[PDB]
Design a binder for this molecule. Structure first.
Ligand SMILES: [Mn+2]
Ligand SMILES: [Mn+2]
Lengths: 181, 192
């Protein structure tokens, strides 16, 4: 388990600050709940502090670049973290399917092993959150499923193909299995 | 390392929610960064999920009681979590030293080992935060810190001695001891 270094504490503070007005979809929960959860999931599988920090910051460029842009990211955490985060910042294609296929194509071929690990943690927590929401609110949550089953199934297979079996894609599989049931 | 369970996820969201507009003193950093840092620290030393949850929620009753009270803490996370968080409550004395004396007395005997551990993670992250600010803003923050550095050194070194006596050299006490000596070197470098 990585120790809480000055650099890691700075990333934790930056993630909270940059997303301070950012909310998880469907409620009022501050978005940093998700970022911290992704970092926590990554800490069980890597020693790479750059990977933990890019986990904390992997949505900043996409979702709050008015608060924290790529230049600031690099000046605070260096070029490697900025490249990891930029691997995961997906371009604005119009069609959902098109964006999904483009993410999945990149994930299977171009993305670094480090990027695939973060993406596994990212998608795992998102699916964990979906399952929590379904249990709390019920089958009507979908109006806000078969597409989602395909999406997380595809992420799970690509994660296995690129990384082999590990603690993160293990849990993603368990979540996909519940989702299928 | 504990898995991220539905209950731990709910604690994570609850801590971020209750403190959503709470900011750490001296800056603009949302307070939840302290809470998750404390939980991450606790996750390196215990597998007790109630302790991780109490770590996430340990400042709710004190700092944002209008957002989240003890009845709700118990409804959401059960009586053991609520008891753990309430173990850290302060005496209602205007005097900082009197409150500090009472809290240390409690930590040394009456507090559960679990509450000592949570308090250790809390004090450790707070001292780490002080040291971070001293290294990045040593320009003028040391001016503000000089007048109370004696209080700070006493406070953190006393918490450290009690934590060590009750818990031994776990990972958090190894780090806390170091941070206390680092605080001393910072006082030393400024006297030199
Ligand atoms: Mn994400
Ligand atoms: Mn605290």
């Amino acid at each position: 388990m990585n120790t809480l270094s000055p650099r890691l504490r700075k990333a934790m503070n930056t993630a909270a600050w940059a997303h301070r007005h950012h909310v998880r979809k469907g409620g009022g929960i501050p978005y940093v709940s998700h970022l911290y959860s992704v970092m926590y999931l990554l800490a069980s599988v890597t020693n790479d502090e750059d990977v933990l920090i890019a986990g904390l910051l992997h949505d900043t460029l996409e979702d709050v670049p008015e608060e924290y842009n790529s230049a600031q990211l690099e000046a605070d955490f260096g070029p490697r973290v900025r490249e990891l985060v930029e691997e995961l910042t997906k371009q604005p294609l119009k069609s959902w399917k098109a964006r999904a296929d483009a993410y999945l194509l990149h994930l299977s071929a171009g993305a670094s092993l480090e990027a695939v690990l973060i993406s596994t943690a990212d998608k795992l927590h998102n699916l964990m959150s979906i399952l929590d929401d379904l249990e709390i609110h019920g089958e009507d949550l979908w109006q806000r499923k078969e597409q989602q089953i395909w999406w997380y199934s595809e992420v799970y297979q690509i994660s296995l193909q690129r990384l082999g079996f590990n603690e993160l894609n293990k849990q993603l599989g368990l979540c996909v299995e519940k989702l299928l049931k």
